[PDB]
Amino acid sequence: GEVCPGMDIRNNLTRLHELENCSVIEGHLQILLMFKTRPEDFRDLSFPKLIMITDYLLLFRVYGLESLKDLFPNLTVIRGSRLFFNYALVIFEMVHLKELGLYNLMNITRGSVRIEKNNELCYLATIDWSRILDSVEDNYIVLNKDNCPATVVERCWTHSHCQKVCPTICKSHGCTAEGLCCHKECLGNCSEPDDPTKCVACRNFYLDGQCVETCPPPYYHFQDWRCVNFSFCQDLHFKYVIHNNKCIPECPSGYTMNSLMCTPCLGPCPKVCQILEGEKTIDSVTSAQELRGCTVINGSLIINIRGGNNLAAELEANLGLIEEISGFLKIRRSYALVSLSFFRKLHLIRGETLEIGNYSFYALDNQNLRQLWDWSKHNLTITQGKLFFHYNPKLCLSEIHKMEEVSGTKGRQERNDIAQASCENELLKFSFIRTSFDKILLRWEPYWPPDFRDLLGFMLFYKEAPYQNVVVDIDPPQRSHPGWLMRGLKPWTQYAIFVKTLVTFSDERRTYGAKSDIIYVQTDATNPSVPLDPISVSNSSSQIILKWKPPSDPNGNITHYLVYWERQAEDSELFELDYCLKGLKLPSREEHRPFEKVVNKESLVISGLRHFTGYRIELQACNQDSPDERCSVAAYVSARTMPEAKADDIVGPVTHEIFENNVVHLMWQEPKEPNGLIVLYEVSYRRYGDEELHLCVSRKHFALERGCRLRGLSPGNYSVRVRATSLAGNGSWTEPTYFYV
Amino acid sequence: GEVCPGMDIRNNLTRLHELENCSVIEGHLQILLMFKTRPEDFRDLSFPKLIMITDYLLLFRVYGLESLKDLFPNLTVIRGSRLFFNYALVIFEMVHLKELGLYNLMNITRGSVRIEKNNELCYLATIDWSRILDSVEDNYIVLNKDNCPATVVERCWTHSHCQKVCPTICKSHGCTAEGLCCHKECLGNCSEPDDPTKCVACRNFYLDGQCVETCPPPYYHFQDWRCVNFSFCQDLHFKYVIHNNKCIPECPSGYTMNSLMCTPCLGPCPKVCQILEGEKTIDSVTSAQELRGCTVINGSLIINIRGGNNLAAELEANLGLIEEISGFLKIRRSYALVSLSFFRKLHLIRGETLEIGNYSFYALDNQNLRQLWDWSKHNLTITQGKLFFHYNPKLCLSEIHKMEEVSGTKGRQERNDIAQASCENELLKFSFIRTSFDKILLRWEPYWPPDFRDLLGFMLFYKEAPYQNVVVDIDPPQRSHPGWLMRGLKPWTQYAIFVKTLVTFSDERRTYGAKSDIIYVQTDATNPSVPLDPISVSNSSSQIILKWKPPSDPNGNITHYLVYWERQAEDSELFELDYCLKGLKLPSREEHRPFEKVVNKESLVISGLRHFTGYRIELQACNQDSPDERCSVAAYVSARTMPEAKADDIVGPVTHEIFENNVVHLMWQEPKEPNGLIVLYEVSYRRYGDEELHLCVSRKHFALERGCRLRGLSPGNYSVRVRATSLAGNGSWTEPTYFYV
Amino acid sequence: SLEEEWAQIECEVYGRGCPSESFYDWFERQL
Amino acid sequence: SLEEEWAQIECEVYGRGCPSESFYDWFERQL
């Protein structure tokens, strides 16, 4: 059959007759707005040749129609390549339709079904769309009048046609009247089962009367449903491109037209933007937004923005991507515009279209246009046309001569082509520069115009310039070298400074004055900022890891970090307090000092530290090493080493002395190297046949009694065990001393 | 004698001969730079008539002179009204002088003496300046060759003249050869003692050949040394004023010339500032600084500032104080100038001097001058001359017509006198305004020029205007009422809003567009800020005074302060902890709640509170009363009442029970209403012939034993006293319970 | 509130678009 | 430092005046 594009048939049924020879519609078919059609107009109107619709089918306001079983008897597959609001089948407001009648449709590859507001429409609840569409949750079929196989009730569409159901083994390939599955590449149905050439539709692609899963080279996929040779795509190109074996109408993003395959071309994609009759005036942000991404322009550009606000950033973002101009360039009546520097990629002007009077560049009524381009690094090329310069006081003959030399149009301009203003032709130099950590002194040679009265002072412009890719009034000097001093500069910062003189535009030839060159001056360094966030962790018994963040203000190139540490002595009150009573809630935690220089590092490790010993780590940053290091103030952090697990164990033989009156004197050797200090000693003694009894020996008690002295002890065999209580926790009980009294 | 002004004699000695008839110099006398004079020129050169010098005497580079005993024999008083660097006598670099010789000087009323670098000068250490000057600490007499009364060494000046010393009783009035004191009004000396008419000089003032302490009316003091009539001062005025009976050359600050006494005239003092040949051009801040305080100008003003920076504040501060202009006014080539509004007091232009061509007001080359004056409240008067308006695009015919109508020069201007620009002649209105606490919606009727393409959008200007004494781009509407919304407005703030349309200046008659009127819109109020700094003090036992500061953000008119209070319960652990052991360090410190509304007040008083009871005072501010008060979040402060001084005293009869085995059971009644709670009870018991013994009863002990139970008590007579220890401190001991066992 | 009204007027006079021309809207586009 | 030098040059070329014409200066004013 013949392949045809999509139609939008309305008003009259004559345009429908073009479907008589179409078997596949490469597009969408819409049928709408017939208020005169009657059922007598549709009795023998049929299009059995049509089978598959690529995009979608739409029916709207169709009067006189009652069923599609005659109009579209053999319509089988709706690919749904392009969807009408995610619908491949739209049946809206059918006043006279009584049934769908489409007894050959079996699969809708993409899209949903919307059947709404169709009065008199029946045989809808008997349609099983689940076997047609992979997902039917999006189907919107509401507000209607609503032998054959039965699915979860019988499925039917007409009084004579049942709903065909193929076996699950056949999948979506279809089945014949006998139920045998079609070919794996068959879609819809098959005149002969298991035959790719006999498929009424192709599941993946159609080529040479056959159904294939892909288009072999050199054939490329077309409309995601067929395969076409390169010749057809090329013919379509001349009133289409090739990319990934697809004859897509246009290349994707990031690709350029390589004379017929798309080729990557980085960001800037060479494209020919065709202007309406080759003429367009830019006056607003939205006007320039239409030129987004353009690189080659097939027309002339006229620039006239009647604004008043600095919109240079937006213009540079939108424009500046064009490299060649076919036509002429005109600039006129630009008030807010100050320069043409935002024309980033503007290099060549072909000038095929010229302004009247043989002009390629036109300039008029420029009230603020002082500079054209950075001719030191920007190059401009002009092919044809003459330059125009008139009524532009802000632009003087120096810039005009520079641009004429750059373009190469020296012997191309005649008379009258070229006719408060910063046009300092003369040059100034700086005589003496002195720098401080925050103060800068500048000195330049004095300048005197022929009429010294025209001089009205100087303008100094300063700004912080980290990169070299680039408002103070100074009184006129009295009638040697004028100078200035500034103090508001951050240390270790680069500032761009240029001085502009102030001259009076007299009635005669005004002395244009002298401009000083831009210079970059770096402020002197000083003491850096404090390194905050100091964390010191005892990752081991005697190992301390210290981490910190670099200071907020480097104030120069940081050379190193100066670290000090000092043993932190515990409170003396702990050596005199008694804890044997109730309330045993134990709180658990110039001179030269050992110093470290952390160089090219952000962490430090400290070893050889006593267990459970506090330390006051002091941190400073220094941006200087040999000459009297400039270091910030001290940053203090407390670090405590983890105590030993054995320092709390009592060692030494426990000695006991028995008096005549059953008085026991207990001598024990304390762990002379404890976990900081021992608050008290815990003793648990128990006679045979009795219960354990607890006792506490304080530091004062241990010092005065050299241990313990129990009095009034009953006869029997005792057991003596002593536990040393330190800050790290309870220690280990002594060996059981057994004595009989 | 005759009175003469000051002289500055130099080069030649001829000009000295004018001193022959001068007895009093009303000024200073300087004698300098004679390189030809010789001692033979001064042998009989004398001026005995001269007596007193008002300001000072100066001698410099006087060659040939050796002594002043002949030149100035009778010079007696140096008043020092005007001092040469605080010196009334300067004797600098006398090469040939050998002695001062001024044997008649006796008092220097004001100033010091400087005698430096005078070689060959002797008889200096013998001069006593203390009797001459009140203070001689400022005398600078360095680097020189250096019968008679003796003062702390004899005082002399020449080989024949002694230093006259008057008795202390004579003070500075002088004394004759007999030592008798002169008259009380005499100064210097007196031919006849005690005679005001015979004084060689007047201490206070001189009048009619007599010395007086003040000038009686109508005579006024002149030069602080004499008295003159009003006729003399008036004659001096016509090539002087009267103020406080003083013929001062000029009136003091804050006074005006009342046609001949100075009269107060508030700040603006009417003064005639005479311009050099009646012409002056203002182009700089220092140029305008010369016109500070001027009110009436006798000349013409030309204004042309070739600057580029907004210096309107400085110009308004300096200028704007002038009310009348005798000459013409010209404005030309003003770039940075935007308006003439800073001419605060400029009302009348006399126009006596006119620009060539019969022009009083000239205007030319005004590149930014958009407005002249606020003609709604500012009035301008032009007497003569014609207006000029040319090459001023920023000023249009509307302002010109307004100023012509205001001045009253309608029928005074001929042809050619009057010839990107904000000149919106048409008016706009706002259609709908909606306000929120931080958001404002504006709506105005659409505007369409005859050429809608010329419209390029709208400009909205907003600023916070607390007083009515007074930058957003809006896209053009599509081809009903355009509107805008803003959200960055503080609550309860007034903002001034006016919308300006954007139109294109076409080649033909440009449509000037329409401007919208300024409006003031106040943002809606909201919940105010938190009232910080809450201080609550128990000024009494049950009185709490609460003070706070108003919230930082009122967010409306604050209606009242909402205050809540709640009893703060103490920690329960204090009711279970035992404190009888060592370590007696005592730490000393929906629902409806009682609320208060502080209205028109910043402090609150709370009564009826239990002693030593904590309270959590909650404070909020509300700018609303009836309709669902908008109150800020709670601010919490802790207040503790001062405890009672008697609640810690134990009351009730102390009971004791004696057992058979000398066991004592003590029952006491605790102060059921204590200062918060009682931590423990302190008991001190002492038998006769023994020492006091201490005991503690804890809360647990008191609860379990219902008091105390002492065991093992020796026979004798005991004394029982119990003290209750509360948070407020130690209580009062119980009555001494005496029992014999 | 003010946000919804501002959005409504923005779509009414500036045509940024609170409504997107939908399945329904295309039909009265044809009428 | 830089402040004293800046003041010196200010009085040297702009004549704001670090020195005030003194007792001495008036004499060489006459010479």
Residue numbers in the entry:
A (entry chain B), B (entry chain A): 5 to 150, 168 to 173, 179 to 265, 277 to 296, 299 to 458, 465 to 515, 531 to 539, 549 to 658, ...
C (entry chain D), D (entry chain C): 1 to 31
Give the published text:
Insulin binds and activates a receptor tyrosine kinase, the insulin receptor (IR), at the cell surface. The activated IR triggers signaling cascades to control many facets of physiology. A previously reported selective IR agonist without sequence homology to insulin, S597, activates IR and mimics insulin’s action on glycemic control. To elucidate the mechanism of IR activation by S597, we determine cryo-EM structures of the mouse IR/S597 complex.
To reveal the molecular mechanism that underlies S597-induced IR activation, we determined the cryo-EM structure of full-length IR in complex using the complete S597 sequence comprising both components-1 and −2 as well as the linker connecting these two components. The cryo-EM map of the IR/S597 complex was determined at 5.4 Å resolution, indicating the structural flexibility of this complex. In contrast to the IR/S597-component-2 complex, the structure of IR/S597 assumes an extended T-shaped symmetric conformation, bringing together the two membrane-proximal stalks. This structural feature suggests that IR bound with the full-length S597 represents the active ligand-receptor complex. Each S597, which adopts a helix-loop-helix fold, is embraced between two IR protomers at the top part of the extended T. The S597-component-1 contacts the L1 domain of one IR protomer, while the component-2 from the same S597 interacts with the FnIII-1 domain of the adjacent protomer. In this way, one S597 molecule simultaneously engages the two IR protomers, thereby stabilizing the active conformation of IR. The linker connecting the site-1 and site-2 components of IR that consist of six residues was not resolved in the cryo-EM map, reflecting its structural flexibility. Our structural comparisons reveal that the conformation of one protomer in this extended T-shaped IR closely resembles that of the protomer in the Λ-shaped apo-IR dimer. This structural analysis strongly suggests that, after the apo-state of IR is disrupted by the binding of S597-component-1 to the L1 domain of IR, the two protomers undergo a rigid-body rotation using the L2-FnIII-1 interface as a hinge, leading to the extended T-shaped IR. Indeed, we did not observe the α-CT motif in our structure of the IR/S597 complex, which suggests that once the α-CT is released from the L1 domain, it becomes disordered.
